[PDB]
From Swiss-Prot, chains A, D:
GO biological process: bioluminescence
Stated name of the protein: GFP-like fluorescent chromoprotein FP538
Complex formation: Homotetramer.
Post-translational modification: Contains a chromophore consisting of modified amino acid residues. The chromophore is formed by autocatalytic backbone condensation between Xaa-N and Gly-(N+2), and oxidation of Tyr-(N+1) to didehydrotyrosine. In addition, the residue N lysine undergoes cyclization. Maturation of the chromophore requires nothing other than molecular oxygen.
Keywords: Amidation, Chromophore, Luminescence, Photoprotein
Species annotation: Zoanthus sp.
Length: 223, 224, 224, 223
């Protein structure tokens, strides 16, 4: 349905520039859109090794990978196979700001999902936990998703926390807009999406590489 | 009954406040079910009524004792009883207005009653905005994140709240709370979620400004 | 002397406050020169001393009557006299803490004295931070932007402030003020700048917490 | 001094993507670095006509154009001819966020200053004053500039206001980092910089074009 099988293959292309550093990453993955799990492998093909932590990029590389229950309209899967676009701002507690823009499309032939990402940040402190690579993982989150009735789009709101190697937290505010390419027939009532996102660095002598795994579920307001 | 608490209980409220320069004083009584996370309270404005602003900005100002905890998570609030606890919270509204609230909570075991004393102050709400124009209906149901601060012995609350407007729209507000037991706790909870739902019905009339709040709160671990 | 004002004048202060849950009350007297924008005040903590926090967060809490205006800009504050004016201000500190301040100012023509009554509340300052650790020295000189809000008859103040730390560093705070004359003004100023410089010297000892503030303020148009 | 004459010629290259819209602008100008005035002409060479207001870009296209008094260290002119780089975040009252990154260099041969700008924004409201082109001019500002002692860099802080066609204001918060390419010998004490920046659109049937003029002076804390 909507050009999607239970198991799918996926591909990523990030162009970024963080604190003045330009880089370029590409990746491949195997996801399960209906179970809302995915797993992708990324490899830096310019600007390696990155002067900053891998974690700020995690959210840059898809709400299609989110288990919806029957009774909540699945905006993202609905928008397929044409797909959708989002833009997102990141505000970190220590004054840095990243913006990310993404264009997602499905190739029904390939049974593959294409991501094309623009990612830019500034004013990370040189001796801060990002630029000094002090971060372990984003902590599990509960994102609020809300319709915007007359624009035909969705709004993402979530206060994220990056876990630092000493045990502390590094707060970021994500505010996403999600916008399907087609005019959506049916629109969701607001709900929640919980996320659990992991990273293992798999770097080596030649390339910088790591793997992400996400699991995302939508839930209602319930109670 | 181990912490001055009981399945069914009773509550009382005193808020002194000033919003956009306007002073007020409100009190109320309520019946609560701490272990089921259900409370109900009736409030009356006794000085400075009718409020030139919406009642809704005050609702969250008036107790995380009223939260259903599952047994696998340390209930810091109930443990803090009967001495009880205090919190300070900031409200950052999308149209730039800011409120602060301080609250002291304590249990009278003799009365089986829980006492709240609330200081609430707010500045720079636009005259033409949905608060000073009383365009608001109700806070929308929420999911608050609660995190331990191990070495301070205190909890931090972070939630992005939304107030519904009669039009149909949303008016955002950022709540950042610190909750601090009066007595050094031995067990601290690992972080978790608490979901809230809070409704209001105005019950006013000619003589007095009055209204009722119903809150239902449950704590969860991460769902995954 | 047209607005209850004089070249040389005298002032008095009452602040009730609560920061990170700690209640206090402070008063003071001062001598001011409204037309030269120079004031000097001595403050004493009379309830809840010694403060568990830095004195500096209160300084800007304690009057834009004390501002040298050039003759080509409407001085809304002096015009508001002798009835006077009120303001509400929010302090957003970089380490997430938030304060709110409300102030009522009025002149006694009989005393040639200017009366300030200040409500000041602050929440969520980190225990280990430069405020609760009293690491602060002095606000750094500023340039505040003042803008008319024509149809509300009121002024908005916006300034990014910096508090110097003994290390050498800066600790930022965002001030957003509304200033509101008690009486509907006929002339409103076009927007302008006001530059401030505000110094403190603690004058405390065994018996009482005491200190002195000196402020000098001048208003400018855009320099270009 | 520092590879700069009293009158200079200047050139601009912006790549941007705003609310998902990609574009590309180039420009030329005549500036007076020591009198702190400049004037540049810009022309959109991709993505014209822009779906958003010209004004959000003004600050994207140089603190070399700033009259310093003798007694304040001129960081920017000092950093020349090698030049400098900056990154800046824009936070607008209605929740939109833009980031901009710039690389400035002087060509002593040409007596010309080169700008190369990356500019990206998200989450402008579709019916807001930006996307609906409701803006007239940035209102005159007073920017605070502060040394960062041990990093060898400067920090920019200024609350900006865009004037709307109805007469109101649209607040943005600029927070810039300025970073010379060379290790600076001497460092400034903090000061102010006042700016007055103007726009006149000079569009026509074929291209979108407009002119900016700035005047910037540094002043001390004085009083």
């Amino acid at each position: 349905k909507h050009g999607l099988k239970e198991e799918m293959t996926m591909k990523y292309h990030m162009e970024g520039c963080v604190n003045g550093h330009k880089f370029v990453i590409t990746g491949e993955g195997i996801g399960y859109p209906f179970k809302g799990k995915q797993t992708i492998n990324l490899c830096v093909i310019e600007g390696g090794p990155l002067p900053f932590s891998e974690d700020i990029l995690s959210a840059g590389f898809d709400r299609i990978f989110t288990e919806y229950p029957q009774d909540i309209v699945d905006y993202f899967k609905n928008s397929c196979p044409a797909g959708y676009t989002w833009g997102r701002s990141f505000l970190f507690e220590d004054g840095a700001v990243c913006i990310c823009n993404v264009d997602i499309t499905v190739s029904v032939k390939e049974n593959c999902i294409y991501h094309k990402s623009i990612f830019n940040g500034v004013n990370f402190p040189a001796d801060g936990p990002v630029m000094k690579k002090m971060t372990t993982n984003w902590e599990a989150s509960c994102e609020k998703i809300m319709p915007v009735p007359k624009q035909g789009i969705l709004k993402g709101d979530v206060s994220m926390y990056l876990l630092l190697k000493d045990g502390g937290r590094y707060r970021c505010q994500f505010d996403t807009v999600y916008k399907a390419k087609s005019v959506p027939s049916k629109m969701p009532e607001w709900h929640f999406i919980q996320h659990k996102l992991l990273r293992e660095d798999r770097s080596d002598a030649k390339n910088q590489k790591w793997q992400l795994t996400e699991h995302a579920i939508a839930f209602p307001s319930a109670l």
